[PDB]
Amino acid sequence: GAVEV
Amino acid sequence: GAVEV
Amino acid sequence: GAVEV
Amino acid sequence: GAVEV
Amino acid sequence: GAVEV
Amino acid sequence: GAVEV
Amino acid sequence: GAVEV
Amino acid sequence: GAVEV
Amino acid sequence: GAVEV
Amino acid sequence: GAVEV
Amino acid sequence: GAVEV
Amino acid sequence: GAVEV
Amino acid sequence: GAVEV
Amino acid sequence: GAVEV
Amino acid sequence: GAVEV
Amino acid sequence: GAVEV
Amino acid sequence: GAVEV
Amino acid sequence: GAVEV
Amino acid sequence: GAVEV
Amino acid sequence: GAVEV
Ligand SMILES: *C(=O)Cc1ccc(-c2ccc(-c3ccc(CC(*)=O)cc3)s2)cc1
Ligand SMILES: *C(=O)Cc1ccc(-c2ccc(-c3ccc(CC(*)=O)cc3)s2)cc1
Ligand SMILES: *C(=O)Cc1ccc(-c2ccc(-c3ccc(CC(*)=O)cc3)s2)cc1
Ligand SMILES: *C(=O)Cc1ccc(-c2ccc(-c3ccc(CC(*)=O)cc3)s2)cc1
Ligand SMILES: *C(=O)Cc1ccc(-c2ccc(-c3ccc(CC(*)=O)cc3)s2)cc1
Ligand SMILES: *C(=O)Cc1ccc(-c2ccc(-c3ccc(CC(*)=O)cc3)s2)cc1
Ligand SMILES: *C(=O)Cc1ccc(-c2ccc(-c3ccc(CC(*)=O)cc3)s2)cc1
Ligand SMILES: *C(=O)Cc1ccc(-c2ccc(-c3ccc(CC(*)=O)cc3)s2)cc1
Ligand SMILES: *C(=O)Cc1ccc(-c2ccc(-c3ccc(CC(*)=O)cc3)s2)cc1
Ligand SMILES: *C(=O)Cc1ccc(-c2ccc(-c3ccc(CC(*)=O)cc3)s2)cc1
Ligand SMILES: *C(=O)Cc1ccc(-c2ccc(-c3ccc(CC(*)=O)cc3)s2)cc1
Ligand SMILES: *C(=O)Cc1ccc(-c2ccc(-c3ccc(CC(*)=O)cc3)s2)cc1
Ligand SMILES: *C(=O)Cc1ccc(-c2ccc(-c3ccc(CC(*)=O)cc3)s2)cc1
Ligand SMILES: *C(=O)Cc1ccc(-c2ccc(-c3ccc(CC(*)=O)cc3)s2)cc1
Ligand SMILES: *C(=O)Cc1ccc(-c2ccc(-c3ccc(CC(*)=O)cc3)s2)cc1
Ligand SMILES: *C(=O)Cc1ccc(-c2ccc(-c3ccc(CC(*)=O)cc3)s2)cc1
Ligand SMILES: *C(=O)Cc1ccc(-c2ccc(-c3ccc(CC(*)=O)cc3)s2)cc1
Ligand SMILES: *C(=O)Cc1ccc(-c2ccc(-c3ccc(CC(*)=O)cc3)s2)cc1
Ligand SMILES: *C(=O)Cc1ccc(-c2ccc(-c3ccc(CC(*)=O)cc3)s2)cc1
Ligand SMILES: *C(=O)Cc1ccc(-c2ccc(-c3ccc(CC(*)=O)cc3)s2)cc1
Ligand SMILES: *C(=O)Cc1ccc(-c2ccc(-c3ccc(CC(*)=O)cc3)s2)cc1
Ligand SMILES: *C(=O)Cc1ccc(-c2ccc(-c3ccc(CC(*)=O)cc3)s2)cc1
Ligand SMILES: *C(=O)Cc1ccc(-c2ccc(-c3ccc(CC(*)=O)cc3)s2)cc1
Ligand SMILES: *C(=O)Cc1ccc(-c2ccc(-c3ccc(CC(*)=O)cc3)s2)cc1
Ligand SMILES: *C(=O)Cc1ccc(-c2ccc(-c3ccc(CC(*)=O)cc3)s2)cc1
Ligand SMILES: *C(=O)Cc1ccc(-c2ccc(-c3ccc(CC(*)=O)cc3)s2)cc1
Ligand SMILES: *C(=O)Cc1ccc(-c2ccc(-c3ccc(CC(*)=O)cc3)s2)cc1
């Protein structure tokens, strides 16, 4: 899981 | 699961 | 998981 | 996991 | 894990 | 892990 | 781990 | 680990 | 580990 | 470890 | 504190 | 604190 | 403190 | 302190 | 202190 | 102190 | 002190 | 003191 | 003192 | 004193 901002 | 903002 | 900003 | 900024 | 900036 | 800037 | 700048 | 600048 | 500058 | 400059 | 996301 | 998302 | 993301 | 990311 | 990333 | 990254 | 990276 | 890297 | 690297 | 590397 990649979190953006 | 990727979270955006 | 890569986090951006 | 690579973190950007 | 490589961290950028 | 290599850190850039 | 190599650190740049 | 080699550090640059 | 070699340090440059 | 060799240090340059 | 207030948070706006 | 207040939050607006 | 306030946070805006 | 305030943080904006 | 304030942080902007 | 303030930090901007 | 302030830091900008 | 201030640091910019 | 200030440092810029 | 200031240092720039
Ligand atoms: C709690 O009872 C022990 C525990 C805690 C955490 C974990 C995890 C294993 C893998 C995790 C993970 C999944 C996805 C992401 C984002 C994208 O890759 C990050 C971390 S948490 C297991 C047991
Ligand atoms: C709790 O009883 C122990 C526990 C805690 C957490 C987990 C997890 C395994 C994988 C997780 C996960 C799924 C999706 C995401 C987002 C996208 O990848 C992140 C993390 S949580 C298992 C047991
Ligand atoms: C807690 O009960 C012990 C514990 C804590 C952390 C972990 C983890 C193993 C792998 C993790 C991880 C997954 C994804 C990411 C982002 C993308 O790679 C980072 C870290 S957390 C297991 C047991
Ligand atoms: C806590 O109960 C003991 C503990 C703490 C940390 C870990 C980890 C093993 C690998 C980790 C990791 C996963 C992904 C990333 C980003 C991309 O590579 C960094 C670190 S945390 C295990 C047990
Ligand atoms: C805590 O209970 C003891 C502990 C602490 C740290 C670790 C780690 C092993 C490997 C780690 C790591 C993973 C990824 C990265 C970024 C990319 O390579 C850095 C460090 S943390 C294990 C047990
Ligand atoms: C803490 O409980 C004892 C401890 C502390 C640190 C470690 C580590 C082993 C390897 C580490 C590492 C992983 C990746 C990187 C970046 C890329 O190579 C640097 C350092 S931390 C184990 C036990
Ligand atoms: C702490 O509990 C004792 C301790 C402290 C440090 C270490 C390390 C072993 C190897 C380390 C390392 C990994 C990667 C890098 C960057 C690229 O090579 C530097 C240093 S830290 C073990 C136990
Ligand atoms: C702390 O508990 C005792 C201690 C301190 C330091 C170490 C280290 C062994 C090797 C280290 C190292 C790894 C990588 C680099 C950069 C590239 O080579 C430099 C130094 S630190 C072990 C135990
Ligand atoms: C601390 O608890 C005692 C201690 C201190 C230092 C060391 C080291 C052994 C080797 C080191 C080293 C690794 C890499 C480099 C750069 C490239 O070669 C320099 C020095 S530190 C062990 C125990
Ligand atoms: C501290 O607890 C006692 C101590 C101090 C220093 C050392 C070292 C052994 C070898 C060292 C070294 C490694 C690499 C380099 C650069 C490239 O060769 C220089 C010096 S420090 C052990 C115990
Ligand atoms: C004993 O009472 C120790 C203690 C614990 C917590 C506090 C605080 C009261 C209010 C605080 C605070 C929250 C948010 C913000 C920013 C958003 O408005 C500032 C201050 S901390 C005092 C003493
Ligand atoms: C006992 O004192 C435990 C404790 C620790 C910390 C706090 C907090 C005081 C203020 C906090 C805060 C305000 C705003 C924000 C920005 C998020 O929107 C983050 C944290 S936490 C209270 C009690
Ligand atoms: C004993 O009473 C320790 C203690 C615990 C909590 C508090 C707080 C009371 C109010 C707080 C607070 C909440 C939110 C905000 C921002 C939103 O309005 C600021 C302050 S913390 C005090 C003492
Ligand atoms: C006992 O003191 C446990 C405790 C810890 C922290 C707090 C909090 C006080 C203020 C908090 C807060 C206000 C606003 C926000 C922004 C979200 O919209 C986040 C946190 S938590 C109370 C009791
Ligand atoms: C005993 O009371 C020790 C103690 C603990 C915490 C505090 C604080 C009260 C308010 C604080 C604070 C929170 C947020 C901000 C920025 C956002 O408004 C500034 C200050 S810390 C005092 C004493
Ligand atoms: C007892 O004193 C434990 C404790 C530690 C730290 C604090 C905090 C006071 C102010 C905090 C804070 C305000 C704003 C922000 C920016 C995020 O949006 C981060 C942290 S934490 C309270 C009690
Ligand atoms: C006994 O009270 C020791 C103690 C602990 C904490 C503090 C602080 C109160 C407020 C602080 C602070 C928080 C955030 C900022 C930047 C954001 O507004 C500045 C100052 S530290 C005092 C005494
Ligand atoms: C007891 O004193 C433990 C303790 C330690 C540190 C603090 C803090 C005071 C101010 C903090 C802070 C403000 C802003 C920021 C920028 C992030 O958005 C980071 C940290 S932490 C309180 C109690
Ligand atoms: C006893 O009280 C020792 C003590 C501990 C902490 C402090 C501080 C109070 C406020 C501080 C501070 C936080 C953030 C900033 C930059 C962001 O605003 C400046 C100053 S440290 C005082 C005494
Ligand atoms: C008891 O005194 C423990 C303690 C140590 C340090 C502090 C801090 C005071 C100011 C801090 C700070 C402000 C801004 C920033 C920039 C990040 O956004 C970093 C650190 S920490 C409080 C209590
Ligand atoms: C007893 O009180 C010893 C003590 C500890 C800490 C301090 C400080 C208070 C404020 C400090 C400071 C924080 C950040 C900055 C730059 C960002 O604003 C400057 C000064 S240190 C005083 C006495
Ligand atoms: C007893 O109080 C000894 C003591 C400890 C610390 C200090 C300081 C207070 C403020 C300092 C400072 C922090 C940051 C900067 C640059 C960023 O603004 C300058 C000065 S040191 C005084 C006395
Ligand atoms: C008793 O108080 C001994 C003592 C300790 C520390 C200091 C200082 C206060 C402020 C200092 C300083 C910090 C940063 C800079 C450059 C960035 O602004 C200059 C001066 S040292 C005084 C007395
Ligand atoms: C008793 O107080 C002995 C003592 C200790 C330290 C100092 C200093 C205060 C400020 C100093 C300083 C820091 C940085 C710079 C360059 C960056 O601004 C110049 C001077 S040393 C005085 C007396
Ligand atoms: C008690 O006096 C111990 C002590 C020793 C030295 C100092 C310093 C004063 C000024 C320092 C300094 C300023 C700038 C730079 C350039 C780096 O960016 C390096 C060192 S150290 C304070 C207290
Ligand atoms: C008793 O106070 C002995 C003592 C110790 C240190 C000092 C100094 C104060 C400021 C100094 C200084 C720091 C950096 C620079 C170059 C960068 O600005 C010049 C001077 S030494 C005085 C008396
Ligand atoms: C008690 O007096 C111990 C002590 C010794 C030396 C100093 C210093 C004063 C000025 C220093 C300095 C300034 C600039 C630079 C260039 C680096 O960027 C190096 C050293 S050290 C303070 C206290």
PDB file of C-alpha atoms in Angstrom, chain K:
ATOM      1  CA  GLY K   1      -5.073  22.234  16.229  1.00  0.00           C
ATOM      2  CA  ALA K   2      -7.068  22.058  13.012  1.00  0.00           C
ATOM      3  CA  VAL K   3      -6.445  19.701  10.103  1.00  0.00           C
ATOM      4  CA  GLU K   4      -7.670  20.044   6.520  1.00  0.00           C
ATOM      5  CA  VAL K   5      -6.868  17.104   4.263  1.00  0.00           C
TER       6      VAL K   5
END
